[model samples]
Target: RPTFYRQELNKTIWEVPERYQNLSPVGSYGSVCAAFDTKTGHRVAVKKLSRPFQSIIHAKRTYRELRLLKHMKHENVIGLLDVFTPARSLEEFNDVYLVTHLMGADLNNIVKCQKLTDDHVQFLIYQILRGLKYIHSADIIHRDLKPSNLAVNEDCELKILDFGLAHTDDEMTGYVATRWYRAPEIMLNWMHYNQTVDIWSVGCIMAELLTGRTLFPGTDHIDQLKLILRLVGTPGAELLKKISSESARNYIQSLAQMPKMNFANVFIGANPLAVDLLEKMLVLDSDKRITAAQALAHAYFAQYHDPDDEPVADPYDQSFESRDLLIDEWKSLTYDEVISFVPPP
Candidate 1:
């Protein structure tokens, strides 16, 4: 089957009109398609959930992304322009469609094409930190942070995307292979996790932007752990003992000690201050890692910090963890959230 427009899908509120066009897909799945928004008289991206209720996981991911996008409003974060459902009412509703502003491309491609000058690196990291500050201050964790997940434009605007894996300032359960930039605490099965996990991802991303390569290009969990250990060096015995998993601790111990390399030596030609900030962000001890706010203070980003760069505080109403949700329950909850939402004025 071919892709359908808003009017074709019976969600005329998102109608892009006849002259409209599809630019690029927002996600690898054909679900998210970029297009022009006649309602806003500008370019926009439309994401249609593909059988969201087909599985409990899909139902949960759909609701989580819907709630976060509806609640969050940040310049460096993806914004929800509008939402629509083809179903006439709750009885008929199953598919959820999201509309957001279009961007030039994600950071994944931008990093490789550009010369990746120091200024580019600084501004990119600044945008990410600013976005992260807003997110963390709101008491949320982005869990998944990487180059491709970060959307950017030629004007240098960067916004974080993909809230399917986002979570509250709690839990440490997920450790999938897709988590290349995942933190040490998460890998070791530590008790809890928080906003600092995002910073560790920032460290990995910063290194990528500076060197034009994935800092730790591991193919699996064990390899990923080894990559992290070799670069950051083996953790102290005391810290290793604190790991919540006996099997995990034993596996880490079995590996030979990989001495930490100086950031300066690893990321040569990068500014000394830049390396300093990277080291601070990538600390193995999650407790000791530099915070988003502290990172904005670092000399590396001194040129970009503004005391007034605060987001308009908006009260958000929902936080959903992935759980066994029924299809009807999922539809009812998200449908209510969509209709009841009021954007910041």
Candidate 2:
């Protein structure tokens, strides 16, 4: 039997519960978690997206996230529980709310609590790879992958969350993901890409996990690419030709040529196994970047954990179940129902 809980609804104020309020804010995003009685004292994380757009983009993103979660079921992925739109008459539209199961603190938060043992880092990386593998297998690219987005449970199980920026592998375009973690392909504004972008992010996450800091904490996009180029070596002639932006090309060319540098030497005293994995992932060329599947099969991870082992149960399964209970809450609307709200010319 599970404990049952109900959230109080207040019209005058926007309040996120206390228990869910204290998880360290990752970057500029805000989040809250609360215990609910829907399934008997089940805990859930509620993320209130600060307005990204004034019109339909928010709704579209919300719908897209919901649709994506509906089709994705993996032990290493965060479980989407439910969504709530403020109740209003047809004439009024208000803020929206997203509900998901509360798992362990994010990888960034966990790392801050203690110095990660090599074994723990390897385990964390393995879980991230498994999650990325599942997402890529479904043809989805999590355009954003960082420590803040990687959630870990009490048992050391990991789950990847935040799909608002994710896109299908076939439809990838535009500059997405934080600057520090953005892939070089994206930095050069390349439209044609595959699951490699996620691999790039995985590499960035791995680096951060090991170092307890962002590997390429560039102040801007160009600076970010500069840092990347420094670690991975400048892009070759053929690689530079693929870049669509003249500015990006000029920037790459202006930089003096340098021999390939090993990240193992760059981050002194870093684990050799972790460095080996980072080198494969942080490749400048998207084509050569290690895939999540390949990373999972890498000797570094294989030496630590078997990819075929049965994954642990997700702690947020009940929240997902509860979300299903409220699916019909929003009147069913077709794709065209909300397309009018797209950004203006």
Candidate 3:
């Protein structure tokens, strides 16, 4: 395990480990490379974080992602295989490399290819729900849950990826989520919300997988609400009262009353159960949206749902979120995390 070859990416030289061969750039999102892990005889992805300590935001996000990936250990959640740095001392540490399993493609590409079957859709969504059930149980919300974040292989096995935007249950800020997959509650700036926001994302993703087109292709946040209202119709006054923000309530009520579109008609010839699950997840009220556990139990996945197989995780510790660490402090913590990783047996 001394070393292997070196390659330059984004002006940074990558000194890949001897155990990993055939190193080549896979894609972006901070210099990701795919290589053959000779030890495991399988492909692995290596993501390099260049100058992670250059800014407080990047440093904290990097630390959060590394910690979350290390903590999560579900089959449908991408596993961190290893963490390493070529730098020998804390002062020299500039780049951090995170190793994870390599998938053939992400769901975004697969959806565009238009080759998925009915079974593929069910199985893929089942895996997402299964992974989400584990994630929600841990009291973490994956605010970003689009198709690109869902990695898939030839066998149709899907794993949730990218924890940089994830937050624990106790935290909330105005920064919502990705445009199209964002929850309506977040768009309206509702005072209180929960994990159901992710349910809305799952609904959008499910719809895209079925139709090969975005469900709410909004050009702007305001237009996003317009598109949602056009399909789901205006929220009832009774439901609008639950929103703690008076401005948000008035905004919902001010919009002209619209009739809800029929899911069966929208997605013509799709499975009734799938449409039913979509309706349950795309509800305007976050309180009424289906939980990950509930979605897994829906008739749509009855054939694949197995209570014995579904696993839950204990709540994750959010002690670090409360800390306000400087660059040096985060760098030291990240270095410790990189050195302490023990690859799974």
- lDDT by residue (255-302, candidate 1, tens digit) is 878788777888889899988888888788788888888888888877
Q: What is the lDDT of residue 306 in candidate 1?
A: 86
The Cα local distance difference test for each model comes to 0.75, 0.63, 0.84
- Best of the candidates, TM-score: 3
Q: Which ten residues in a row have the lowest lDDT in candidate 2?
A: 336-345
Clashing pairs in 1: none
CA-RMSD of model 1: 5.2
Instruction: Give all TM-scores, in the order shown.
Output: 0.84, 0.72, 0.89
RMSD vs true structure, all candidates: 5.2, 9.1, 4.0
lDDT of 2 by residue, 49-160 (tens): 5552334544444555555655556778875555444433433444445566766578777877777878888898888887777777666777777777888878788888
Give the candidates in order of TM-score, highest first: 3, 1, 2
- Give candidate 1 regions above 4 Å deviation: 1-30, 166-177, 188-191, 312-326, 342-345
Q: How far is 175's C-alpha from truth in model 3 (Å)?
A: 19
Candidate 1 displacement at residue 83 in angstroms: 0.5
